[PDB]
Amino acid sequence: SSILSEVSTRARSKLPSGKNILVFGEDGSGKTTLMTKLQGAEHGKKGRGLEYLYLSVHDEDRDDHTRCNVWILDGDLYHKGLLKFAVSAESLPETLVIFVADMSRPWTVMESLQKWASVLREHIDKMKIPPEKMRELERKFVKDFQDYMEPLGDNVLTHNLGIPVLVVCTKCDAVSVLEKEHDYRDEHLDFIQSHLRRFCLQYGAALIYTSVKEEKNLDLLYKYIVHKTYGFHFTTPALVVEKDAVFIPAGWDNEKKIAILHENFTTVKPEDAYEDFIVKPPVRKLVHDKELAAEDEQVFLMKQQSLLAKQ
């Protein structure tokens, strides 16, 4: 009618809301702890399937309160049909994704990366986005990547969804634990850093090292996510000086910035397969005792018949 025009046109100052930041990942990776700690609580409760976290974001410069939708999702592939509930076309333009890389198990990081490589894009194509909007958001994300200031290439954003993509790696406190207990070489750390940088470059993703135990980069994570989902001011430079905690801004990564990382390690060429370079963690648990099946009456009786016949 005529109301919904007159009253709607009377719009005042506000801050954009209804932003949908999504997190999936391998189960048991401390993801729940990560996003609850970012929310402020020490830890909520875990569970199965999709879970709701509302991220209360306050801009002290403007003195307003906004809540963003953190929907953590369980790592079970069986629970993959419910992702339709998580992401919709209306919410699509304001979607941002974060990886939960439990560095306590680096072995399972890269194949989980390709697990998302399957799952996220099968979800995005199965929802039938019109090509025009997909293309326009893709080029918008491309240009936003290109205007970094604190690029172009053959593989830069060679395949992506045109939405802000984040990746973080947790359990940073345990990298020393596996450094000593597994004799995990620092060259292995350099190789995995190069490989993650390559993946984030080909997808326009940004990685930050973090550890709730060390309370590391959590403020940086909050600053970056709010700056990305809303457009807030950002001033933290590219923290890449130390390998303990590395922050790669979206657009900071360059192919020569990965070649310089390649240069430091010379044990095995980075072109090798991911799982070949890293040592597989052997299975500890022993196989259950074999079945002590009893010979049934029929074959035992015929065997005894044969025995008596031989007599």
Binding site: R10, R48, E51, Y54, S56, N69, Y78, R284, K285
Partner: protein, 97 residues
């Protein structure tokens, strides 16, 4: 017009309720032979000790979860629309006639 609980609470509390309704039957410890079979000398893993594999054993498949979440966001969306209707009254203090 302020929501003393944010609209996100309408879904968060309901998710807590459904998680409780899931744990009441899921948090059951798993029957095991470890009582005397000490040969598996290792702290019982949470996924097996607490019997957290029931969801994969749906007789009707995951459709139950899909139905549940569909109902949840349907209720949340309709109530959010109803509240948004109330927010349309905000003009009563900031207009120019």
């Amino acid at each position: 017009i302020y929501l003393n609980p944010p609209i996100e609470e309408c879904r968060y509390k309901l998710y807590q309720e459904m998680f409780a309704w899931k744990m009441v039957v899921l948090s059951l410890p798993r029957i095991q032979s470890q009582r005397y079979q000490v040969g598996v000398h290792y702290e019982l893993t949470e996924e097996e000790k607490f019997y957290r594999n029931a969801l994969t054993r749906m007789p009707d498949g995951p459709v139950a979860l899909e139905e549940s979440y569909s109902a949840v966001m349907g209720i949340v969306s309709e109530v959010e629309q109803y509240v948004k209707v109330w927010l349309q009254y905000q003009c009563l203090w900031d207009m120019q006639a």
